[PDB]
Ligand binder design. Structure first.
Ligand SMILES: COP(=O)(O)[C@@](O)(c1ccccc1)c1sc(CCOP(=O)(O)OP(=O)(O)O)c(C)[n+]1Cc1cnc(C)nc1N
Ligand SMILES: COP(=O)(O)[C@@](O)(c1ccccc1)c1sc(CCOP(=O)(O)OP(=O)(O)O)c(C)[n+]1Cc1cnc(C)nc1N
Ligand SMILES: COP(=O)(O)[C@@](O)(c1ccccc1)c1sc(CCOP(=O)(O)OP(=O)(O)O)c(C)[n+]1Cc1cnc(C)nc1N
Ligand SMILES: COP(=O)(O)[C@@](O)(c1ccccc1)c1sc(CCOP(=O)(O)OP(=O)(O)O)c(C)[n+]1Cc1cnc(C)nc1N
Ligand SMILES: [Ca+2]
Ligand SMILES: [Ca+2]
Ligand SMILES: [Ca+2]
Lengths: 554, 554, 554
């Protein structure tokens, strides 16, 4: 008859279809834990709030759904800050639920109070707000969710004072609302759409770029449709890559980065259809080198700020990426009178291979396992029933080079924040989502990066999560060591060596399987053996340091 | 002639007198690393920016000096937020230098740019500011330090864009300024001072309570003079305990907490003189349970806000605590007509040691090592040559029932943040300060909290810091587990159990000495062997979970 | 028996000795108005919240006490923002009490809610906070007051939700605390003090500069004392000027600006004792031109950030300015063995006159009343029973030139914000304070500036406040017109002419006396006539535009 505010949170979460939370206990948030027990809603409790926040991200990114993080007042919240800022920059819809000091006893110098968590999250969230009344919990939870899920997706921080959670109200007087928000996005205007399609057909060498917004809606069948109908080849930033996974093979350009060569091979596009991809780091800023100044850019983004940010564009449209692709698929179901593009579709596939082979031809494995050969070993196990998470710097740069040539169930790599160490929690949340889909998660990280959340092997074991963590161990903070050397002087290395530590022993000390390997041959067996088992695994791989990936260098 | 913004920063730090930085590398801040090679200033690099921030804190606290943390753009910053908050609430002077995105290329969606780091830190720093031009560096750095070191001490964040730091200027054109800020603090008006002395002279059961501003000023000798002259017992909060270590024992009350039973037995102080003690968690808020409602209170704080925050006071003075301690000492040297107070000193001692005896009497170690028994073992090794850091909750609440009876060099416990896991980095920075004075550092932490920063074992070994890490392993997030059992029910634990992982094992995988123990005698031998060696160690002590410490039982 | 939160505010205000509020009604704050009615506490209700906020400032500045502003939710608060930011920069202690949306009905899109007033005031206040509980009102009001009153003085924003004000509690259960904070400031350390006094005596040509902090404490008798004893001549920024009013005439340097000449007349000080004066605009930044690079600066400020901000200093001391002067007066009551300084004391007075006379010699009144001659007419009525407020730009620049040569009861002019139009509310609040002291307020403003709050003649009449507003009417935004001309081109005037409007008619339409005058002779009669009456007065004075004051020019 009388229920707690924490029970209100959870009943509302359920109504929204939430099935998993990620967090770390504290008394301020106990009422949420008790309610979960009762509705049998697993809370995956980790060893650091960062890893819990990153888990929520990975789960949202892998499952294309809402991720939910739960942390307690004070240090709970401050340890979640890297996750919030990462999700903000990657545009991932996560609800961060955070405990806080009771409203009574404001300004009392009390335990875990006196920290304005809302004010700190405000610069990095789509919405940050503190609940003032137990009665408000459901409408505010549901409002927070709508803000997170709608285009562009992003993090939200709902702060729940201890007071407000512990307070009990008459359960017959309160209304748990529905989540009532169309999953069908908003589409462009038909004029704008025709105009787009007209520019499309009348042009010679066109590409589609995908951004994160395209993976969040996951309008897969509509993507292939529109692609069959038009024969326009498709590139992607990291986050869009798994969207190419169900394409006819011939028209997969893979990673947008390998669009770089196209100046030299004189085949730069005359038209780019940017769908959710933003001007900036992953798209070569406004420099011209990936997206030509001479090309006609058509850009669809839910944020009008993003439209042509760094470079003159020919048409800017505000809409939902998912809703647009759908519109594009429905419009070319009316058409079937589309130009051929044979030269181009092969001219696309051929150049991506030539770059792959140029790395392939370079790269010798004498006296040090080459980072590209490790990357290849990994690529050989990657199909649509595998999510790959990448962390590490050099590690991920090398990895990206083999990644265009495979069709993963997911690909979760660093966004604009570039924060080393987020991989562990990410992959761990990804694997929760993968479990419900039958996929399997592999984390590829550096020896620097892994040390951020290595304690998570513990969580992997307690909750029996089959993640495979592969550590590219080059005994250093590699990209940064490189920078010191190439930028400052061969003699100028400091603070970037990591010549110590047995990570597989750390993993085994936590109760997971740990392999160390230092040859191609022993790596594949370890990998195959790890894939073969339903256990958490660590694979510490010795890897050459001084090879330089393309994306540094020239 | 030509130097980087990096050298500018470093030259100014030198001029101000800093000997050690704490950090972790990034290209954005590399110019600062280089400038530290040349001037041969060590930068203790960690495995997590959080651990680095905390070390600068431990160093500032253990050595009563400025702590300097150095971190990179984006993730480097967000990982520092917790130490910053932590320093904020404990009033500890730490300069946080952070790199950020270049000012040119502002708003370009570029790597590690794109979060407003000043906006995030503003709610938890004394000052937060972004540098606009290389020529501003030395005045801005010097300003940062002044703000960090003045009363009350706290954290400062100085954001340093990549442009500013890479930019080169002719060394001739910019003057490095001096640290002009006399070290003596402001004192009370002689009329206030007299009124306080006046009150102090006519009280039957007077008491002094010290707080953190007393440890940052460290007027040990002035304090002796004044305690010796007036014969008034001294208590302290966690942060002020080492200030009681130069004092005759007949007038050490120990920790404030043990004022509890003075009311609970008809001996409540007449008059309490708070020096930097704030009203709040550590002084029993406004409850009057430690600082009684009936007593007259003279409060001396540098922040008017704190004066009588929760509870009326007789007299509120805003001044530096150290300055005030000096003033008091030297006013007290010259009026030698101070009543005896021998009785009162006795009653105060009897009650402190009654509590202690009483807990001894009821602590049985049959069936598992009792945490009070474990805390006694640590206690038998503590004096002025040892810094004790405390983390973990139940762990520090039991530990703290023994700390009154010993006289440590340092005692670094949780402030208001209450953030589990900050201990490891704190202790690491503390052990750096301690080497300057040949002291030894010991960390006493829970099995939950050590998991936050378990990877600092690697920093211990690569850096040859002989920190001894003691884990009180009760296989749970203990205090939270007790909360579930006591506030909800026996049947109602979830999320609080951690029955997995070999912590000694982890530490060994990183090259540190691991020991496992589970009795008085075995722990006693492990600790003695750990002390005998100059190597980092980890000791994992199986400790009972059931016994409730006095704190809780309120 | 049951009383409102609004009654709690007022009972607390009374206990603090508050006797006047300034504001503008709204229903959200009605409970505060009703309580005022009952305790007979005048609320001076104005025509714009800006003018009410500025009134609170002027009253605090003129009375050396707390000013209290009261404004309602939403636009009430946003119209107070210029006042808050002005008070922040001038360091004036004002409590801004603001209404806001009820806590219930947060996020309801309701009337005057949905505006985070705390977040907007946070960058410009010493403390901004929202009350969460009716029971908290007294301790929070009293805490807000202590933050405002203590060094450095500044604005505070206490936000009071409608809910919280309207809620009624048991009046027998709540404690109205006292304001318990020493009025005696904190003094320097004796070593630091002797050192200062030693540098003082051993130097040849020393000056004292005063800043606003010196007028806020108003330790007058202690100022003269220390000045007799030492014979050191005293300068002041605008805010410190009234502090020179009770000095032996021979040692009054007046406005710090006329220290400018001292390079040329080769008489730059060898020592400057900066007391509350900050490095920056009013003190010639760090350029050397007022305070010599070659001089030994001794600076006392409560803000360690301010100490040597822009220029190398010889000694930096953190303390209360008022408490220091007192310390200086008590230390030289022990001395009476002080060097003569005859050359200098005359070399001081003589150069200030020479600059006065150089303007005097220039300046012809043929076909336009000269701005300096108007300034002189005003100066001739200024003694210690007159507060002068200055607004306007050119107007105040000219005025400042006659101001060194008179002894006002107050002098309130623009601080760093330099906001045109704040004069009207300022002078109006000043006059409330002047009424209780028998003084009389004269506002000297431009024709631009007056138009900001001209509606206030209405308030002047409703509350019968004898202010005299003198409008230097030069039919333009004068300093800005000058800038366009001198900086850009004679032909390049736009947007800076104001060739229209009869201000004395506006005043008369509001029921006040209005003079227009266009000669020296007719101006003095109008002034004398206005002084002679106990009525609000407007005096529109036609004034030449193209004369250029020194402080522009060269
Ligand atoms: C060019 O900028 P850089 O400063 O070198 C760096 O930020 C970076 C980021 C992306 C790509 C390349 C380098 C990266 S690269 C880097 C070394 C990574 O070491 P790791 O062992 O994980 O992998 P590898 O390079 O050896 O494969 C570091 C420490 N940082 C800076 C950094 C520090 N702390 C945190 C939380 N995040 C960061 N990104
Ligand atoms: C009353 O609040 P509680 O929730 O019980 C807790 O916040 C606490 C309890 C008593 C004293 C101080 C803190 C503490 S106690 C606590 C258990 C820590 O377990 P650990 O194994 O380290 O030591 P012990 O208690 O077993 O000896 C946790 C997880 N929490 C909440 C919490 C979570 N995450 C972080 C970063 N900091 C925290 N304080
Ligand atoms: C319920 O709130 P109320 O306090 O009654 C008030 O806020 C209001 C009332 C009804 C509708 C809209 C606003 C309004 S109504 C109101 C009276 C305005 O008087 P006016 O002479 O302009 O028109 P009328 O009501 O006499 O026709 C005031 C002063 N206030 C509060 C207020 C103060 N300062 C500023 C800048 N904006 C405000 N809204
Ligand atoms: C050098 O900067 P300037 O831009 O000229 C200006 O800010 C200024 C301030 C102080 C001294 C001199 C000029 C001043 S001077 C100025 C003209 C003032 O006209 P007014 O009629 O009051 O007096 P006078 O100069 O004619 O005697 C203006 C509009 N402004 C800019 C301004 C605009 N709006 C507000 C609220 N405050 C301001 N200070
Ligand atoms: Ca590495
Ligand atoms: Ca534990
Ligand atoms: Ca004018």
């Amino acid at each position: 008859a009388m229920i707690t505010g924490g029970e209100l949170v959870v009943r509302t979460l359920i109504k929204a279809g939430v099935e998993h939370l990620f967090g770390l206990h504290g008394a301020h948030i106990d009422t949420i834990f008790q309610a979960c027990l009762d509705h049998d809603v697993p809370i995956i409790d980790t060893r650091h709030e960062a890893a819990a926040g990153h888990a929520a991200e990975g789960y949202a990114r892998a499952g294309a759904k809402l991720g939910v993080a739960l942390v307690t007042a004070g240090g709970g919240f401050t340890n979640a800050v890297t996750p919030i800022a990462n999700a903000w920059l990657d545009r991932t819809p996560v609800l961060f639920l955070t405990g806080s000091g009771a409203l009574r006893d404001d300004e009392t110098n009390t335990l875990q109070a006196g920290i304005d968590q809302v004010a700190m999250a405000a610069p990095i969230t789509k919405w940050a707000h503190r609940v003032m009344a137990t009665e408000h919990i459901p409408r505010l939870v549901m409002q927070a969710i709508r803000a997170a899920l709608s285009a562009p997706r992003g993090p939200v921080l709902l702060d729940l004072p201890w007071d407000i959670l512990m307070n009990q109200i008459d359960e017959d007087s309160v209304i748990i609302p529905d989540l009532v928000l169309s999953a069908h996005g908003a589409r462009p205007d038909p004029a704008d759409l025709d105009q787009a399609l007209a520019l499309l057909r009348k042009a010679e060498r066109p590409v589609i770029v995908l951004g994160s917004e395209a993976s969040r809606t996951a309008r897969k069948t509509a993507l292939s449709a529109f692609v069959a109908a038009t024969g326009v080849p498709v590139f992607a930033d990291y986050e869009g890559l798994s969207m190419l996974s169900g394409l006819p093979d011939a028209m997969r350009g893979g990673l947008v980065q390998n669009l770089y060569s196209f100046a030299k091979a004189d085949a730069a596009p005359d038209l780019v259809l940017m769908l959710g991809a933003r001007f900036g780091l992953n798209t070569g800023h406004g420099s011209g080198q990936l997206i030509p100044h001479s090309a006609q850019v058509i850009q669809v983004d839910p944020d009008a700020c993003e439209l042509g940010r760094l470079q003159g564009i020919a048409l800017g449209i505000v809409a939902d990426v998912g809703g647009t692709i759908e519109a594009l698929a429905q419009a070319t179901a009316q058409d079937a009178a589309w130009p051929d593009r044979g030269d181009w579709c092969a001219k696309v596939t051929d150049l991506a291979q030539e770059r792959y082979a140029s790395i392939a031809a370079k790269s010798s494995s004498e006296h040090a396992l080459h980072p590209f050969h490790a990357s290849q070993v990994i690529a050989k196990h990657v199909d649509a029933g595998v999510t790959v998470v990448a962390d590490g710097a050099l590690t991920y740069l090398w990895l990206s080079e083999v990644m265009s040539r495979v069709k993963p169930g997911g690909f979760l790599c660093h966004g604009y924040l570039g924060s080393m160490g987020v991989g562990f929690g990410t992959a761990l949340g990804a694997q929760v989502a993968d479990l419900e889909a039958g996929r399997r998660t592999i984390l590829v990280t550096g020896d620097g990066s892994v040390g951020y959340s290595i304690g998570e092997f513990d969580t992997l074991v307690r909750k029996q999560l089959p993640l495979i963590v592969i550590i590219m161990n080059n005994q250093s903070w590699g990209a940064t060591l490189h920078f010191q050397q190439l930028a400052v002087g061969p003699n100028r290395v400091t603070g970037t060596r990591l010549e110590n530590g047995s990570y597989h022993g750390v993993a085994a000390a936590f109760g997971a399987d740990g392999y160390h390997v230092d040859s191609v041959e022993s790596f594949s067996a370890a990998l195959a053996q790890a894939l073969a088992h339903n256990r958490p695994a660590c694979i510490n791989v010795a890897v050459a340091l001084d090879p330089i990936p393309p994306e540094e260098l020239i």
